[PDB]
From a paper:
Histamine, a biogenic amine, plays a pivotal role in various physiological and pathophysiological processes, such as allergic and inflammatory reactions, gastric acid secretion, wake‐sleep disorders, and neurotransmission in the central nervous system. The histamine receptor system comprises four members (H1R, H2R, H3R, and H4R), all of which belong to the Class A GPCR family. The four subtypes of histamine receptors deliver downstream signaling by coupling with different heterotrimeric G‐proteins: H1R mainly couples with Gq‐protein; H2R primarily couples with Gs‐protein and could alternatively couple with Gq‐protein; H3R and H4R are both capable of mediating downstream signaling via Gi/o‐protein activation primarily. In this study, we report three cryo‐EM structures of H2R‐Gs and H3R‐Gi complexes at a global resolution of 2.6–2.7 Å.
The endogenous agonist histamine and synthetic agonist immepip were used separately to generate the agonist‐bound H3R‐Gi complexes, and the complexes were further stabilized by a single‐chain antibody scFv16. The histamine‐bound H3R‐Gi complex and immepip‐bound H3R‐Gi complex were solved at a global resolution of 2.7 Å and 3.0 Å, respectively. In the histamine‐bound H3R‐Gi complex, the amino group of histamine engages a pivotal hydrogen bond with E2065.46. Simultaneously, the Nπ atom within the imidazole ring establishes van der Waals forces with C1183.36, while also forming hydrogen bonds with D1143.32 and W4027.43. Furthermore, the Nτ atom establishes a hydrogen bond with the backbone of F3987.39. Furthermore, the imidazole ring of histamine securely embeds itself within the hydrophobic core constituted by Y3746.51, L4017.42, W4027.43, and F3987.39. Intriguingly, our high‐resolution cryo‐EM Map unveils a distinctive binding pose of histamine in H3R, in which the amino group of histamine forms a salt‐bridge with E2065.46 rather than interacting with D1143.32 in other aminergic receptors. Consequently, histamine rotates 180‐degree along the bilayer plane, resulting in the amino group of histamine interacting with E2065.46 instead of D1143.32. In the H3R‐Gi structure, both TM5 and TM6 of H3R exhibit unexpected elongations comprising nine and eight residues (2.5 and 2.2 helical turns) compared to H1R, respectively. This elongation of TM5/TM6 regions in H3R establishes close contacts with the α4‐β6 turn of Gαi, thereby strengthening the H3R‐Gi coupling effectiveness.
Numbering used by the authors:
A (entry chain A): 3 to 54, 182 to 354
B (entry chain G): 5 to 62
C (entry chain R): 32 to 235, 343 to 427
D (entry chain S): 1 to 121, 135 to 247
E (entry chain B): 2 to 340
The structure:
């Protein structure tokens, strides 16, 4: 057929390679990829420990779903040059520490850590590569937040606050302030969970949020929505 | 800050090292780029496509 | 004469089916991002509707206008086979699309993984066409040879059945009632799952109102799909079954013809429901403009 | 270390059946196609069978087709030859050869050691080596010629001619894998050239270690055919 | 204050450099090449489409023989293709799928890979076992690897987002030389034809010419208003072209220490991802975020042609050493060869 014996052998080798590539792609298409973000020492590590110098990957399985979590901290380089490489991620897990309202950045004592977290959140959610990517928000260290609000009112970082010095109201106010940063409410959803150092529902919450995201994507792809 | 001064001294040294260059005239550089483009005009398959019998991707 | 109206109406249909469906196919080639399994199913339904719009209706127009079929018994069987194949393929596609949507909310992760496949969709479409043909074509063609045929006075093109109600009941049950019940079940399951998930999320504002509004829109959509399919098809099926058990009696002549033209109206209206609500098809249409 | 060890030989009765096995170690066995090549006590090499990687394609020489079956066991890294209806003409030493095919590869690059099987009691390309033996002296150059009944030059530019060397009491070893392509680990003193149907292998600065039988093979189309073998002496 | 004096002195040196450059501007390139015959419309066709990557392609590199090709995609795979037949010669799985660069050794024995893991992995293509193995892993960068180029079989050069370049001795795995001076991320590298100099563009909107052996910055070229993402040497090694996010390419001359020409258009507002020259150096090819590639007349600054056929951002370009064909790879998962 115009091919020598060695050319036919090479073509058969190519076909075997294609077969292997298809199998690997089929296996990889079933995995749920999550991008983990946070403002430095924001409890991100506790979340990692509970759920389980370049990028770091964690693999875990819940209810027959394989999750690959990519932590992209410890990359002190421009973000705009590599953020687009996570454009297809199923969801962004964003970690915020609730005690930061009473702390300031070590590099800049005049800057409140909560404002830095809000700026990073605003940049991530309104980024052009993540227009339709949902965000799972973890507000960690809630316990320590209850022990300091009674002594350090939210007016230190939220001058306009006019509520009681009780966790129940301060937590809701903080959740509202963080959800007010979403300017794409018609495309992306935000899931908020209050957690602490001894919480076991963190993985179940991620499972539920990812299931909702996947089902909404499937519906949008089938019409209906 | 001693370190800030050291940085400024390094920048000054680099600027001095880059300042003393035997820069040729721009007309000369343009002439030489042209000459190179002319000398190899017929050896460039994408600028002057080759007959299909000579094209490995035909 | 009055015909200038009647034929005129048919002309509109002849174009509405051919244009809209053609347009859908154009998008499929206009946009390369319309290459998921659902999109292939929508294409198959568009092809089924288009072939009905351009071939069956134009050829049937002389028969209705004059009452006589030109070239009788040489085109009767070809036209009948094509018409039945197209109608049954439209029904089967309605069921296939409903099943795909039902899977999208039950086997969510599996579905997300397999959407790109162009081979699975082709295999399903081929199976749909094969079943559509096997259901009726053999009984149209291979009945005259068995029963002695005839039963057709001069040139009327209609199957040797339409007076034996057993085969009519069997074919209708395998062609409409079962697919209608399956479509109803799938759409109801989708609605119930959507309602359950939203409730759980609420248990866990503009965003809230938005989710509920979208759910309401989906509820209206599913209901419209089921209602339109059932309304267009059930009347003709029931009327033809009633005619046969009555042996030609019971049914006014005008009613039989009206029911016949309602099934074709379904093939005309189909592009409005499925392809036009898909966001990717909308994007492709906008790109064409 | 790359290693192929063959087992299962011995004495067998005519009409019987024996299974030869080839155990592989030290390389990606599943990525290589495998050949069984035999050498009767006449010292001429005969290609017997071929099974590709993935077991997609299988070829047999006509003399054994219908009596021999070639198979692989990738997880166990073993190749098998099932021989049934044996005839006296099947007495020989059998070699297991690995061969990998992709652009720029080197087929037939490693041979096994062999199993001695003893039995009691038209369109194929013909390769010719006119000279059977050549007395040589150390330090001098030597030339070995090969002739083909059909041109070995393909429309893609390759000339599928392979040169092998077999030293006394050892397995054959690849020297030139495509006309003018020296094999890995081979001294530069060996060189090859040719055209279409006439090929030459040139050896410069002959060494005592370069004494043996030189074989010419074509890989243009199956079945694969070898030369008669040219022998160097002294 | 020592610092004031240093800053003032820096400014004096910068003014001296500016004046020395301006004194060499006898006549623009466009005035000299005014009487050159235009190349005319350049029309190229797609000869091959290379399928098999299941995600965005980020890089490709031609083999020195002009036939074999290596492409990297973030589906975790490095693929070596035979461009004449489209056969896949090799498929190399990567320990880290966040690859952003790849390289082909001039001898064809090795391939290089790197990305967000901050590591440059060296793979041996010609082993006795018949597989491709990671022959080495070079670590020492603190940011992502953006580009790598084999300077030889035992030497390689890398650039990263930690603002530095490094010359590595592959045998020992150590870094022999470090090139510092950029204030932003280094995005691209281009070795000289004689391999004794290299040029790098950074996100500080500048390019620097480095001497390999000395380990010193020879020259600094400015003029782009945004990040420089691509860079390429002129075939004779006396000039180079840089593409940035400001939607323009620029041609800089090494001996005149200035910028000869700008390649820009009013209909182009996206960034430039890749640039390369044709064998003669007459045509400059540049890939864009517009999903296509433009062919420019390097000596006249006129658009000579357009290569369209990708459904997403064109990420990588290459021209064979023999000049026969161009290769484009994009985020649509396909590579296309044009002639
Ligand atoms: C344009 C589409 C969507 C709707 C209109 C379709 C028209 C062409 C259809 C709808 C109902 C049809 C009529 C149904 C009943 C009869 C009675 C019969 O004894 C003569 C034909 C006649 C009068 C039909 C001719 C075609 C008809 C008028
Ligand atoms: N299966 C019935 C075919 C039909 C009825 N009306 C139009 N076409």
């Amino acid at each position: 057929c115009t091919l020598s014996a060695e050319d036919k052998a090479a073509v058969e080798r190519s076909k075997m390679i294609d077969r292997n590539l298809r199998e690997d792609g089929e296996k990889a298409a079933r995995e749920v990829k999550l991008l983990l973000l946070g403002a430095g020492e924001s409890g991100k590590n506790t979340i990692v420990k509970q759920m389980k110098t370049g990028i770091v990957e964690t693999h875990f399985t819940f209810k027959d779903l394989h999750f690959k979590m990519f932590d992209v901290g410890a990359q002190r380089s421009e973000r705009k040059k590599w953020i687009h490489c996570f454009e297809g991620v199923t969801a962004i897990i964003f970690c915020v520490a609730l005690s930061d309202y009473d702390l300031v950045l070590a590099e800049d004592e005049e800057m409140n850590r909560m404002h830095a977290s809000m700026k990073l959140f605003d940049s991530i959610c309104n980024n052009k590569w993540f227009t339709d990517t949902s965000i799972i928000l973890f507000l960690n260290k809630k316990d320590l937040f209850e022990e300091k609000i009674k002594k350090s009112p939210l007016t230190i970082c939220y001058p306009e606050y006019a509520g009681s010095n009780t966790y129940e109201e301060a937590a809701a106010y903080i959740q509202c302030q963080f959800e007010d940063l979403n300017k794409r409410k018609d495309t992306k959803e935000i899931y908020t969970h209050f957690t602490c150092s001894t919480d076991t529902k963190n993985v179940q919450f991620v499972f539920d949020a990812v299931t909702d995201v996947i089902i909404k994507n499937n519906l949008k792809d089938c019409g209906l929505f | 800050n001693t370190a800030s001064i050291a940085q400024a001294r390094k920048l000054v040294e680099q600027l001095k090292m880059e300042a003393n260059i035997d820069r040729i005239k721009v007309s000369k550089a343009a002439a030489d780029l042209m000459a190179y483009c002319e000398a190899h005009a017929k050896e460039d398959p994408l600028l002057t496509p080759v007959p299909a019998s000579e094209n490995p991707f035909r | 004469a009055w015909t200038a109206v009647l034929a005129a109406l048919m002309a509109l249909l002849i174009v509405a089916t051919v244009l809209g469906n053609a347009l859908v196919m154009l998008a499929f080639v206009a946009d390369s991002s319309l290459r998921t399994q659902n999109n292939f199913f929508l294409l198959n339904l568009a092809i089924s509707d288009f072939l009905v719009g351009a071939f069956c209706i134009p050829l049937y127009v002389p028969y209705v206008l004059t009452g006589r079929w030109t070239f009788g018994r040489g085109l009767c069987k070809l036209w009948l086979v094509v018409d039945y194949l197209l109608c049954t393929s439209s029904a089967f596609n309605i069921v296939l699309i409903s099943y795909d949507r039902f899977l999208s909310v039950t086997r969510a992760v599996s579905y997300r993984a397999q959407q790109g496949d162009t081979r699975r969709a082709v295999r399903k479409m081929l199976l749909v066409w094969v079943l559509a043909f096997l259901l009726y074509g053999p009984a149209i063609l291979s009945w005259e040879y068995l029963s002695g045929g005839s039963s057709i006075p001069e040139g009327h093109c209609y199957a040797e059945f339409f007076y034996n109600w057993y085969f009519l009941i069997t074919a209708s049950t395998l062609e409409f009632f079962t697919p209608f019940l399956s479509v109803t079940f799938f759409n109801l399951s989708i609605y119930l799952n959507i309602q359950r998930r939203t409730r759980l999320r609420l248990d866990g504002s503009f965003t809230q109102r938005f989710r509920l509004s979208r759910d309401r829109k989906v509820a209206k959509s599913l209901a419209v799909i089921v209602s339109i399919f059932g309304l267009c098809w059930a009347p003709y099926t029931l009327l033809m079954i009633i005619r046969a058990a009555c042996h030609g009696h019971c049914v006014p002549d005008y009613w039989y013809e009206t029911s016949f033209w309602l099934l074709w109206a379904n093939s005309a209206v189909n592009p409005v429901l499925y392809p036009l609500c898909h966001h990717s098809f909308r994007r492709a249409f906008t790109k064409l403009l | 270390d790359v290693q192929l060890v063959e087992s299962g030989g011995g004495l067998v009765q005519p009409g019987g059946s024996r299974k030869l096995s080839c155990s592989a170690s030290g390389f990606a066995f599943s990525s290589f196609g495998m050949h069984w090549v035999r050498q009767a006590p006449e010292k001429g090499l005969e290609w017997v069978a071929y099974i590709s990687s993935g077991s997609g394609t299988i070829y047999y020489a006509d003399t054994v087709k219908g009596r021999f079956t070639i198979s692989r066991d990738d997880p166990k890294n073993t190749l098998f030859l099932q021989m049934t209806s044996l005839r006296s003409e099947d007495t020989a030493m059998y070699y297991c050869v690995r061969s990998i095919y992709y652009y720029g590869s080197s087929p037939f690059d490693f041979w096994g050691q062999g199993t001695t099987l003893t039995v009691s009691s038209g369109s194929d390309i013909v390769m010719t080596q006119a000279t059977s033996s050549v007395p040589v002296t150390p330090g001098e150059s030597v030339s070995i010629s090969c002739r083909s009944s059909k041109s070995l030059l393909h429309s893609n530019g390759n000339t599928y001619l392979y040169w092998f060397l077999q030293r006394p009491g050892q397995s054959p070893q690849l020297l030139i894998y495509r006309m003018s392509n020296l094999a890995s680990g081979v001294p530069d003193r060996f060189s090859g050239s040719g055209s279409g149907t006439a090929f030459t292998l040139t050896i410069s600065r002959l060494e005592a270690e370069d004494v043996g039988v030189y074989y010419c093979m074509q890989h243009l189309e199956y079945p694969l055919t070898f030369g008669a073998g040219t022998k160097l002496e002294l | 204050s020592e610092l004031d004096q240093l800053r003032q002195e820096a400014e004096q040196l910068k003014n001296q450099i500016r004046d020395a450059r301006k004194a060499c501007a006898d006549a623009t390139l466009s005035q000299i090449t005014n009487n050159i015959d235009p190349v005319g419309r350049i029309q190229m066709r797609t000869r091959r489409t290379l399928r098999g990557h299941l995600a965005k392609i980020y890089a490709m590199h031609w083999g020195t023989d002009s036939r074999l090709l290596v492409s990297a995609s973030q589906d975790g795979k490095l693929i070596i293709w035979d461009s004449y037949t489209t056969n896949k010669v090799h498929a190399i799985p990567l320990r880290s799928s966040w690859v952003m660069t790849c390289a082909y050794a001039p001898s064809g024995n090795y391939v290089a890979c790197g990305g967000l893991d901050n590591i440059c992995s060296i793979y041996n293509l010609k082993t006795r076992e018949g597989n491709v193995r990671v022959s080495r892993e070079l670590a020492g960068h603190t940011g992502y690897l953006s580009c790598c180029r084999f300077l030889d079989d035992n030497q390689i050069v890398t650039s990263s987002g930690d603002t530095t370049c490094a010359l590595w001795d592959i045998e020992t795995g150590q870094q022999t030389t470090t090139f510092t001076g950029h204030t932003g991320d280094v995005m691209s590298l281009s070795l000289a034809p004689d391999t004794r100099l290299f040029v790098s563009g950074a996100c500080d909107a500048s390019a620097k010419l480095w001497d390999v052996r000395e380990g010193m910055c020879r020259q600094t070229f400015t003029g782009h208003e945004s990040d420089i993402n691509a860079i390429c040497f002129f075939p004779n090694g006396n000039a180079f072209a840089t593409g940035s996010d400001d939607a323009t390419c620029r041609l800089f001359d090494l001996r005149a220490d200035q910028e000869l020409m700008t390649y820009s258009h009013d209909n182009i507002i996206c960034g430039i991802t890749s640039v390369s020259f044709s064998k003669s150096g007459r045509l400059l090819l540049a890939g864009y975020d517009d999903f296509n590639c433009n062919v420019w007349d390097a000596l006249k600054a006129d658009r000579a042609g357009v290569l369209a056929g990708h459904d997403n951002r064109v990420s990588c370009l290459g021209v064979t050493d023999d000049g026969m064909a161009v290769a484009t790879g994009s985020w649509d998962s396909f590579l296309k060869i044009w002639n």
